[model samples]
Target: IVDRAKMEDTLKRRFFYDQAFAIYGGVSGLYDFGPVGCALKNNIIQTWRQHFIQEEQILEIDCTMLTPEPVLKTSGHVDKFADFMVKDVKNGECFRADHLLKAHLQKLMSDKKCSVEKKSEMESVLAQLDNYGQQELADLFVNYNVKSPITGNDLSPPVSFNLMFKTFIGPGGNMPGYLRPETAQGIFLNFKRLLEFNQGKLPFAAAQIGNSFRNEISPRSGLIRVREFTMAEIEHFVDPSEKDHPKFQNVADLHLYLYSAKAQVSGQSARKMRLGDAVEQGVINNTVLGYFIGRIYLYLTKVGISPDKLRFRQHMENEMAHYACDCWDAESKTSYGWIEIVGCADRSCYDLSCHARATKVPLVAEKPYVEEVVPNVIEPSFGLGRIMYTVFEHTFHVREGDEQRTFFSFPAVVAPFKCSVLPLSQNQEFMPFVKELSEALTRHGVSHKVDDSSGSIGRRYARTDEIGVAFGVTIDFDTVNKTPHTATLRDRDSMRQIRAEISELPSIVQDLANGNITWADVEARYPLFE
Candidate 1:
């Protein structure tokens, strides 16, 4: 098992990210990514762009973070985007009501004396926890005798707490505005313009990657629950009557681990099924939704998220958003248990219709031979910060019985730096050779770092590995004295070294960084260091 403390310490000591405003005091649910963390994040975003934006020919947009009150009101966020909260009767400390109930009930269920009927009831409650309203949650609090975990005091009745961060948009509080709760609303607000940009097409998608804010009553569990974070969202507009995707055939055969709503209610485990069969059997609702689900699975695994630790869970009836007809979450199992990193929902034209009704603006798509129709939206929303955190934890591993060799085994495509160029020693003779090799790597569009500092080769390699640098090149005496200059190439995972001529370094490193070849191929081609 991975040690959480050791992994966190590695991240902080290596400057992956740290608490925001730490000088005076740190704020909960806020963070600032340092150089290494930022690089990794950028690489992840680039991969997302390639998979969704460029490959799918999606129209990417940048929208304002501050949204008008009217926009949110129409979308039902102003009235209904909330969580049930309960406070300690004595100290007035607040807690999310559902979370509190679930925790306590889980403990009760764990007791050996718990009856089978009680366990069944507890399981049903937990499975449909998201569907409960404030009154129902309040009843659970009273019925289950839930108390404050911190103070062990009685809890107050559950009440609604709107999550949007409220603010004034103009001088002297002239206009009411709010920090956008999600990126999907922005895409929905611009439906008419995006439709026009796409030449009034029936099927098109607009994607946005940006920051969103939520005023959580209590933000805990590191990046899993945060007040401010980055989001990547795609709003794919399709005709309501025709929900099939043109490219569905390409992803039909892809297999996914699915925990359906029926399975959840019946206490069954997730089962592996082909995307095509799931859609045809009416398990996933439509072909477009299935296509995006397969695409998400591919993207997540490609970026180093373990497939074994990932599954798609269908949302229960009460668990889905008000606008969502069907919903599925791509959940990743971590030290914190199953956490949702991505949500794919079939919105069924709710957003466009709501905005149109509220503003009296026509948000409809029309065709030459077909009647005007409100385009249904298939939205795939990603929590960028959460996904990044999962990647860090999931890729992290310590060699068994060799704790000293801890590292993140990120995929070459998303590792922060492609390679690290190290000089075997800080000798004056090695400086020129190191500079030439580093420059050569730069010319090939490879991201690498030169560690000419005074440190042992092994120590420098270890440091680079911690930050997820996949490959290493070392300049030694052989490079300067040999007939043909040669450098030692090291793989982070295997810690195996191979010697290749300096002339071939650029191509070899480039291919490795681009994932065009594997270390097995490299070992077969180049002479291994004995």
Candidate 2:
């Protein structure tokens, strides 16, 4: 297991990311990504673009952060974007109702002395956490004897609390506004424009990658849930009559964990199933939804999220989002438990209908007889913070036989740098080779580092590994001693080295980073180094 505390320390020490305003007293649910963090984040976003927008030729757009209240009101954010909150009676501190109740229940259920009946009841309550209303959550506090974890004081009955940060748009303070709760609504507002850009076609996608706001009542688990975080939303608009996807066969045979509603009800664990069978047998029921689920799986795994730790869980009737007729959450298992990182939902003409009604405009496609047809949306929403955090957690590991050596095993596409350049020593003879190799990688646009510092080679390797440099180039004595100049190319994950000419390394590393070749392929081709 990756030690979370150690990982947090490593992240801060390496300047990957930290609390946003740490010099002063830190605020909750905000973080700042440093150089390495930013590079990794950008790479992830690039991969996201290639995987979704570029591959599918999705119409991309940027939306405003400050949104007028009327837009959100019609989109249901003014009313439904909320969570139940309970206030500490004594201290006036707030806690999320579901979190508190689940915590109390989980504690009791963990006790061996608790009666089976009590345990079962607590377990049942925990399962229905998301389904509870404000009053139902209030009842749980009384039934479970839940109280403030901090002061142990009584709590006020839970009430619905809107998560958006409310603000007035202008200095006049007359017009109300909010930091957008989601990017999807902005895309929905531009539905007509996007349709025209697509040559007035259905079965097209519009995507946006931007920051979204959610004023979390109790944000914890590091970057898992934050007030301000990046989100990538893809709204795949298709004619209501055709919910099927054309490219389903591309991912038909791919298989992974699928926690369907039936499995949840039967108390069975998530089972692996083929994507095609899932769609064909009505397990997923919607072809477009299943296709994105498959695509999401491919993207996450390529970016180093462990397949075993990832599952697509079907949202139950009471748990589905208000706009979604059917939804499946891409949940990643971590030390904190399985957390939702992406939601693939089939929102059947909900947003368009809402906006159309509010604007008194027909936001729809035209059919015969001048009939209006609202397109249903297949939305694949990503919580970027959670996904990044998941990538970190999923890829973090301690090298075997050396607990002191910890590193992130990020894929080349997701690594902060493709490789690092290390000279054997500060010897003058090694400088030329270092410069030449550095020039080659630079010319090829491969991000790498050159370290000739007075540290042990192993120590330097550990340093680069900590920041997830996918490969390493060591300018050893052999290069200076040999006829044709050669350097040692090392794979971070295996710590295995291969001897290859410095001239050939640029293209080799390029192919490696581009996923054109794997470490195994390189190992098979090159002479191995002990």
Candidate 3:
């Protein structure tokens, strides 16, 4: 709804975030989070922990970012985790082969000059693009007459490029290593330890939030495609014999926007289907998979994404890894387009089996019917950077009428700062009240800012609004002159204000930030400040 350039301007102007090492000519694929950026990200992560880790009672861990080469090799990252890329013969500009072909085919198919037959053929080729090998992609470039869109030059033959940042362990070149491409593989390797800690229970989950790396040849899309980023993953191990989740009924009646692979190939749009219907009609693999899908839907929307701008897209057959039974991505539609923020997959014994074969230790449950088989994993992984960017895109708003104003209408739970304590004009009389208010906020456990900067009241409010502070408290001369101190509480979105006792302000802000009460409730209780 807002211009991306304007949004970026406000983001950088307010120091939400910026490219890392900008003074050194702005390094590509790296970024540094600012104070506002860090707080917002931290709030989102804390909310995630509360939503899933605490509620589900999932066992969480912190694994080393530098992983041994053998661990990833056995998990297939060494051999299979790569992309096919081609370089411009003359200018040396690199491009992903399939991506380049798809873009070219898309341009060709868009021309009304092309016949219907060409349209279908192009669509078919595009649908199968993910299934192509390096050689196949190289030929596709020739068949489609694709070249560097930037330079209009011929490209070299496509070559497989491994994205992992290779490193050596223990300060020696002999010991090979890699920064982990994913956190899921580590959880799997510690399967027995987790199981033992849980008293050998089934239907439990392991959770983690950690940094992962991928040395992309061409990184774009701001935070969506990055060399290093934060990943939050949950590995929910379930019994194969009983895939029916006990708590599935809680989310059974919910309806979700779903884009199945079948519909994708057939050129149909995503449809809204009830969770129960999906499981009963054999649309989703099981109740467990459907359960997590519903949970993801709830989590995404609760954090501020509109239902219409979100969808659960099933990955095409060729797009999924070999060991995955089924996979669905919770993609959010942003200004950049639909970006994959969360991934939920039914990896059927893929992790445990691979680790078992490598370690020669049979990972089995304690039951007579159990023949050390099928401890299927339902993984719900979140890329926090993409989620953070999507949150910014979806919530960003610009108000224009008599004047122009830019603000993020972030939900209270994720707002960088809950409220601002503005002592209108840096008057000496307001100093004691400012100190008292700050202490009250700390006592009530509400995060806030005291904006005593030399600026007009309107300008100060604008600064707080830009960073998405949900509420504001302004203390004028009237508060200092009063027998019992009172100040006006301001709600950011409505630009409305109410005067209440100073002692009551911080507690009310805390309740609002905790979502225990609403601004309307406070509005009803307190008198208008006008």
lDDT (10s digit) by residue, model 2, range 293-357? 88999998988799889999898777877787788999999988999998888889898999999
Error of 3 at 295 (Å): 2.0
For candidate 3, write residues 1-530 as lDDT tens digits: 54788788888778888899998987677888898999998988998888899988999999889988989888888888888888878987888776778788889889888998889889888877887766777777777787788868888888888888888998768789999988988888888888887777688899889998988877766777888899899999888877888888999898888888888887788989998987787778789898888888887877777788889888887788755868999999877777789988888888788878988977866545545545789999998888888888888887663567887988888888888999876767988889999989989878888996678887888888988999999998889998677898998988889899898888899888878988889879888876
Off by over 4 Å in 3: 109-124, 133-136, 368-371, 401-403
TM-scores, each model vs. reference? 0.97, 0.97, 0.94
Off by over 4 Å in 2: 367-371, 426-428
Q: Which ten residues in a row have the lowest lDDT in candidate 3?
A: 365-374
| Clash statistics: count for each candidate | 0, 0, 0
How much is the lDDT of residue 332 in candidate 2? Answer: 94
Q: On a 0 to 1 TM-score scale, where does candidate 2 land against the true structure?
A: 0.97
